[PDB]
Ligand binder design. Sequence first.
Ligand SMILES: Oc1cccc(-c2ccccc2)c1O
Ligand SMILES: Oc1cccc(-c2ccccc2)c1O
Ligand SMILES: Oc1cccc(-c2ccccc2)c1O
Ligand SMILES: Oc1cccc(-c2ccccc2)c1O
Ligand SMILES: Oc1cccc(-c2ccccc2)c1O
Ligand SMILES: Oc1cccc(-c2ccccc2)c1O
Ligand SMILES: Oc1cccc(-c2ccccc2)c1O
Ligand SMILES: Oc1cccc(-c2ccccc2)c1O
Ligand SMILES: Oc1cccc(-c2ccccc2)c1O
Ligand SMILES: Oc1cccc(-c2ccccc2)c1O
Ligand SMILES: Oc1cccc(-c2ccccc2)c1O
Ligand SMILES: Oc1cccc(-c2ccccc2)c1O
Ligand SMILES: Oc1cccc(-c2ccccc2)c1O
Ligand SMILES: Oc1cccc(-c2ccccc2)c1O
Ligand SMILES: Oc1cccc(-c2ccccc2)c1O
Ligand SMILES: [Fe+2]
Ligand SMILES: [Fe+2]
Ligand SMILES: [Fe+2]
Ligand SMILES: [Fe+2]
Ligand SMILES: [Fe+2]
Ligand SMILES: [Mg+2]
Ligand SMILES: [Mg+2]
Ligand SMILES: [Mg+2]
Ligand SMILES: [Mg+2]
Ligand SMILES: [Mg+2]
Lengths: 298, 298, 298, 298, 298
Amino acid sequence: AAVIELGYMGISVKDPDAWKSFATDMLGLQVLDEGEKDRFYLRMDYWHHRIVVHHNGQDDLEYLGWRVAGKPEFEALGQKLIDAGYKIRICDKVEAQERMVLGLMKTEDPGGNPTEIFWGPRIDMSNPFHPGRPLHGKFVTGDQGLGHCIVRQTDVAEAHKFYSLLGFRGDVEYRIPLPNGMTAELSFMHCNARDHSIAFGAMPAAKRLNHLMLEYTHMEDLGYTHQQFVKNEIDIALQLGIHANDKALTFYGATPSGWLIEPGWRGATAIDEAEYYVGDIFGHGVEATGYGLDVKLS
Amino acid sequence: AAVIELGYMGISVKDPDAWKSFATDMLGLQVLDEGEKDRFYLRMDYWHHRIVVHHNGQDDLEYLGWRVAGKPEFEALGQKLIDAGYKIRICDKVEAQERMVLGLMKTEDPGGNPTEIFWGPRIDMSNPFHPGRPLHGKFVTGDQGLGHCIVRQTDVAEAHKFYSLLGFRGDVEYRIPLPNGMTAELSFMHCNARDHSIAFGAMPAAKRLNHLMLEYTHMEDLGYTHQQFVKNEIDIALQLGIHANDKALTFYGATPSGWLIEPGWRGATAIDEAEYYVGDIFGHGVEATGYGLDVKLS
Amino acid sequence: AAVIELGYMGISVKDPDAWKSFATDMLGLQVLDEGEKDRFYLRMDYWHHRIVVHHNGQDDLEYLGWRVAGKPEFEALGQKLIDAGYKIRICDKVEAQERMVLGLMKTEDPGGNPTEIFWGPRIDMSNPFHPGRPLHGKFVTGDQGLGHCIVRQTDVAEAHKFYSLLGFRGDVEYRIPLPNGMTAELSFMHCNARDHSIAFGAMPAAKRLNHLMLEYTHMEDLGYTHQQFVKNEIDIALQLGIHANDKALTFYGATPSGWLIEPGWRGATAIDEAEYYVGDIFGHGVEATGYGLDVKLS
Amino acid sequence: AAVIELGYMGISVKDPDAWKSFATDMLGLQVLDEGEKDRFYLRMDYWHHRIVVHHNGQDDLEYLGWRVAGKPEFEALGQKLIDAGYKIRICDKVEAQERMVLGLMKTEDPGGNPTEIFWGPRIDMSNPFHPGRPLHGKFVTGDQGLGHCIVRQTDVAEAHKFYSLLGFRGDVEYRIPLPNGMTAELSFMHCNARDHSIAFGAMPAAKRLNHLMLEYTHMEDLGYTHQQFVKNEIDIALQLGIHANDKALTFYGATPSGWLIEPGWRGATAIDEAEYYVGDIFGHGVEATGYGLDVKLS
Amino acid sequence: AAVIELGYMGISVKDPDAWKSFATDMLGLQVLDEGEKDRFYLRMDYWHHRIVVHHNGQDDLEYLGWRVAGKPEFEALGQKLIDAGYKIRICDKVEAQERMVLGLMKTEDPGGNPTEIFWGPRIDMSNPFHPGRPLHGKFVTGDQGLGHCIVRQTDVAEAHKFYSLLGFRGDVEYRIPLPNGMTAELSFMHCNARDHSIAFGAMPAAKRLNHLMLEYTHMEDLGYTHQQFVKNEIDIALQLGIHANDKALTFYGATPSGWLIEPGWRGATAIDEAEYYVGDIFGHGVEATGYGLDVKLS
Ligand SMILES: Oc1cccc(-c2ccccc2)c1O
Ligand SMILES: Oc1cccc(-c2ccccc2)c1O
Ligand SMILES: Oc1cccc(-c2ccccc2)c1O
Ligand SMILES: Oc1cccc(-c2ccccc2)c1O
Ligand SMILES: Oc1cccc(-c2ccccc2)c1O
Ligand SMILES: Oc1cccc(-c2ccccc2)c1O
Ligand SMILES: Oc1cccc(-c2ccccc2)c1O
Ligand SMILES: Oc1cccc(-c2ccccc2)c1O
Ligand SMILES: Oc1cccc(-c2ccccc2)c1O
Ligand SMILES: Oc1cccc(-c2ccccc2)c1O
Ligand SMILES: Oc1cccc(-c2ccccc2)c1O
Ligand SMILES: Oc1cccc(-c2ccccc2)c1O
Ligand SMILES: Oc1cccc(-c2ccccc2)c1O
Ligand SMILES: Oc1cccc(-c2ccccc2)c1O
Ligand SMILES: Oc1cccc(-c2ccccc2)c1O
Ligand SMILES: [Fe+2]
Ligand SMILES: [Fe+2]
Ligand SMILES: [Fe+2]
Ligand SMILES: [Fe+2]
Ligand SMILES: [Fe+2]
Ligand SMILES: [Mg+2]
Ligand SMILES: [Mg+2]
Ligand SMILES: [Mg+2]
Ligand SMILES: [Mg+2]
Ligand SMILES: [Mg+2]
């Protein structure tokens, strides 16, 4: 009984109009606006939505929504969290319906990141994904969930304890030499075939969210997205490259919210056997600075 | 009875030392030096060599070596060329041994590019390919030959006539809008599964050779090669991108000889059904100029 | 309309008893003795036989039996041979029944090797192969015929002309440096998926037959056969090794007749694209001399 | 929670220069020298290293490094060892960094063989394996670890108890008749798909290490390695052959340290169903003596 | 921890000479005679033997040998039997060596059938199976063990209890209408992929053994065996047919011992979901009577 994917996430923004154009044109996400005054939705697949975009916001993460298989796993995981001393709240029907899920609980991770556990997402099988721009392919979701995030943590061991309790596996996978003779350690945790769904280190961070990674089925879509960022003169924090752990081809670019999007292609299957690396396979060179990723990876 | 691959090529250079370091470090080719005063060899696979590098040169193409299956196809193709009015010379044993082939004929294509037809290459099965730097993978050769070239032509129809006679198929595949309201037409011809092995247009060219394309089995090797060009501050004429015909991910970078190398990955199978395009899938943006590829492809 | 396999061969021996023990114990062939005063048979598969062993012999080849698909190909190939000036004889029923074939013609190759062309071999489907010793596996026959032979030739070009007319393809595949500064050229020809079925050079030879190659399905059988030759102190002319053309693991050992047997495993598919080599992949070192294979291959 | 592969090993040598030439030329291993005064590394794959070669040594094993999946399995296995009465030491960070692992513990097996248990090896994905000589293929590592060793034991039952506790399975697989009417019993244990990773008997042994087996992906590399040993007149203790348990084609040759290397090809998958044999499939005949393997296997 | 196959069986006979000719000629088994005064062996595969044939016998079963995976399963199953009140004896080394196994225990089933449990059979990988007559194929053994037996039982529920404890699964699969208005119930139990390895009912039986089933890989071998029984005028108790449970094509014929052999082909995989039938798919008509199988199956 455990978390099985990153199901949805909630973000808040100061400029919904910018975000709509960004999501559709720069990424190929689908905008779904249900006429609600304070929010709209982004789709990737048959799910009613993967991302909720709240208005009047802080340009940061609002919540991560972690899926469990069904009510039995929901109830068991709640009691597990309670038993280990974590503070959780089981939500009422109104709150569950807000997220469009059958069961919902709210807590916060050890870093203060608002964390939701749910079962029973709404799937709109009648409404196939229709991307915000023409795409050669689609997104990799399914058993691997929407993507992955790096979020702020103040205590890596406590964060690891919490995510392990949720059913994640993983540990330190990068030891990065720093220009001070020190080492930066990044830990990466998986809960399904996606090489990682959550990752973190002890680094001071101005925002809850460092970056969100979204994966294309097709290299042609990743390339065109890269071209869109360049044509539109959008900051690329780390250039195209291949991480040693997940082995995806990715780059990192600015969002209208100032945290990074990592569009990518060809992520490898998660492994339970822990390894570490001291650098990337190639690329991911620093280009734009001021984003929390001034580290040497190749 | 026809040409079946680009088997070898000969180039001449002014700086053999630069070329050795370039081939090994920037590309991962193997240098084989047989102690000959005026030449060395580059390997890609079990062939004794794919490229002959002659010293004291012109920094351009010396010859293209087109393979036929055996002596019967050799003899039939010679008589075909003679019958259609082309000037060929069947080489003696000494000349054949120079190229390390069992049978050899020399002619020139309609653009003045020295052209060789041969059967029976020397394979050193005892000496497996050992790349000039560590590689994740290897090169795509085999049935597809060493790679592809764009070479100078003065008359596209005459060039097409000549290569069709050799057993190639293909025609105009790109019509590129030019800043003058004119169109540039590029023709691409295949003789095996490699999407193309020879290509050309009517464009004035300072050299016989515009570019040579070499294909990696592994994207990781292409990325690292791209990183090598950037770290070494080598001119990139056209940035990373995907052509609409061959669908390979490639970039074009300078050689010590001033003509371009196109390192690449994931070329599609040649098709006999002619199509045309007016642009690339993404990328291949102009970066360095002065190389004969100032055209808008995306 | 062409030759499709080496179907059977006839040999003559001075010591049938030695040959029986040799075939069964050292090789795992099946001895079938039909009570004929002057001959016995060796089986490899469901064929009534692959090898006829005649008594009172010369310890050399008596005939090679080349199969065509049926009577139409038989009649067409006969007329082809006649038309090109070769002397053939179409055999009567008694002669055909001697070889246990439906149609039979006799001629000699340009080297004086008695050569038979036939259609319609006798298959004893009721009598499955039962090897002369326990085997892990069986023999590779089927579409590839019984194996391959190197036979004496006095004129390589004439031999090539003759076998090409029979439907074989191939040419010079080895150029072997000799301790005299000279080169030995060996030509290898295929008529099916077996990398070669006949091979030859211009070398003076005391016998029609240099060696016969037989292929095991299982490496374990080849190893045990190698062990049998060693335990029985049988001459090994060339030690274990891998030829660059066929890529089989083989060794060459003496027969009671003084010509060599080449037991082997893992032969590659024949290719129509001619290549040449100047040495083997590894091994095939000279051990026993006096056998016509004192050449340096690794 | 258990050992999952032989991850690394440490050896000490009197002649590092000999070992470098041996590793590269005779075996095709990669030498990696990090400029440390007292040691260098041998690579087989993307791991930073598989073998540590310490200078100023005893020409024997220094340690075997057994990998577990992650920290949870590490902690559970430590407590398991403690609970069963074994003496272990959990290493500090400096000691862990020495081995380039995330967690490290040291103990000794019942035979006095220094034994390490670790999680989190360093993988240099940026630095693909580059063999010390040209290779047709590569090494079999991955889920099967670096290879297998036979090490000295004084009490087979105690050794079995210890390795079973570490998660290995296996028992007596060979009962070898001895020229004294006695029987030699060898036990073989697996911890993954490699047929065995550790093996032993009660035999008096002058060294900790009897032999190390390394596996090639390609038979052509094994043959060429065999040829290298012969050309360089290196002692072969047991000739080419196929063991009945693992079914690999192997030979055993001397190292500069006097213990044996067993280069091999085509190892079968480990089975949990115990069988025994009284001899090999073929070969492995004694050639050079004085190495602890004077036993009759075929 | 459980029984995993019928590994060997022991029978005793009054006429060893008849049995040798029967095994080889009528069935294609291999006779292996180790020069022991009182016994010989029958082989089916790489096992030293599957059947021990004791002389001076009773023309009935002597023992069934049930394999477990290794010593741990051996020790656990012994204690399980003891704990449930069964009488077992763990054998000494001399007794274990008699059966050529690493560990051995003896007991009797609830019907008085001597029952052995063992681990570690002797495999003669060096001595491939060599059938007693030419065969098109071989036997189905491997994970499915040697075959299956129906043995006498006096209490079906007690027999079921005992075999369930050994790790078998299965129950009543046939309810056969009898000419008395009664029903015969036969129970069939599996311990691997073989549809059943042991089967029984409450029927009075003059012998321990009703029949032994042996399976050919090839239908051609089953047909030829059927032809051998007919040509030699050997009693066929039940004619060719297909049972509804195992779905093999089989017949039942007399042995020199008077109990039946069931040669067969194409047995289906065992299923854990219990079904029953009231008749066969076709055939298995009574021919010879006096054998304990006078029941109507089609
Ligand atoms: O420990 C784990 C915890 C959660 C999920 C996985 C997983 C990994 C790959 C594919 C499917 C599931 C896992 O290994
Ligand atoms: O998906 C990923 C895989 C490996 C490393 C990172 C990473 C890069 C820079 C800073 C923090 C993490 C990552 O995002
Ligand atoms: O503030 C911003 C920061 C980064 C990107 C955009 C953007 C939005 C839509 C389309 C293109 C770029 C933006 O507005
Ligand atoms: O017209 C043609 C001429 C020469 C080669 C090909 C070919 C294309 C793809 C794969 C193999 C051969 C071809 O189509
Ligand atoms: O391989 C290729 C595929 C498609 C186009 C080109 C090309 C690009 C620029 C100028 C000329 C040709 C090419 O090289
Ligand atoms: O003139 C030149 C032009 C382009 C590249 C190189 C180069 C050669 C070796 C290594 C790196 C770059 C060079 O010398
Ligand atoms: O030219 C040829 C003549 C005769 C047979 C083949 C052949 C080769 C491989 C597989 C099947 C037939 C062939 O190529
Ligand atoms: O099958 C074969 C493949 C390649 C070469 C030979 C050969 C070796 C020595 C002398 C003549 C031929 C051969 O038999
Ligand atoms: O003259 C001979 C030459 C070579 C081998 C044998 C031989 C025959 C049977 C069994 C073993 C060896 C032989 O007799
Ligand atoms: O008992 C065992 C203990 C450890 C590993 C294996 C294993 C065997 C084959 C393939 C994968 C794992 C095993 O069976
Ligand atoms: O890998 C192996 C498999 C089977 C036996 C041995 C062995 C041979 C001689 C002495 C000790 C063990 C071995 O190494
Ligand atoms: O003492 C030694 C024992 C065995 C082999 C070597 C050796 C080392 C390098 C290259 C070839 C052989 C050696 O030096
Ligand atoms: O309950 C069972 C007990 C023993 C074996 C099996 C089994 C059946 C089919 C294939 C493999 C094992 C089984 O199902
Ligand atoms: O394998 C088998 C499958 C189904 C039934 C029987 C059987 C037939 C007659 C009497 C007793 C059992 C059998 O042997
Ligand atoms: O008593 C007997 C009963 C049944 C069969 C045989 C027999 C033995 C060998 C060959 C053929 C039949 C026999 O002897
Ligand atoms: Fe990421
Ligand atoms: Fe190109
Ligand atoms: Fe040969
Ligand atoms: Fe070994
Ligand atoms: Fe049965
Ligand atoms: Mg991971
Ligand atoms: Mg084309
Ligand atoms: Mg050939
Ligand atoms: Mg084992
Ligand atoms: Mg059943």
